[PDB]
């Protein structure tokens, strides 16, 4: 649903951005 | 208005974040 | 304040994601 | 928790944002 989605898009680019952070660090 | 824009741009930036794991992957 | 703040952070995230798929296309 | 999970991320996402467009730039 409408709810379910945003969040689930939000957690996925957390995700990339953490790793990205990792592979710079 | 200033609710549609916030939305689209989350859009956006889920949709590149998808992207960038399926080039890593 | 801890509005203005989470705003301006999500703006400029949306920026380089657009200018990202831009450079990508 | 729910809430400060999803704002850590968001805080996380905005710093990889601004120090991307900073090596950009």
């Known amino acids: 649903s409408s709810d379910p989605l ?3 898009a ?3 680019g957390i995700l ?3 790793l990205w ?3 710079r660090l």
Chains 1, 2, 3, 4 share one sequence.
Request: charge should be negative; charged fraction near 10%.
């Open 16 to 18: 990339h951005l953490i």
């Open 6 to 8: 945003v969040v689930a």
């Open 10 to 12: 939000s957690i996925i």
């Open 21 to 23: 952070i990792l592979d």
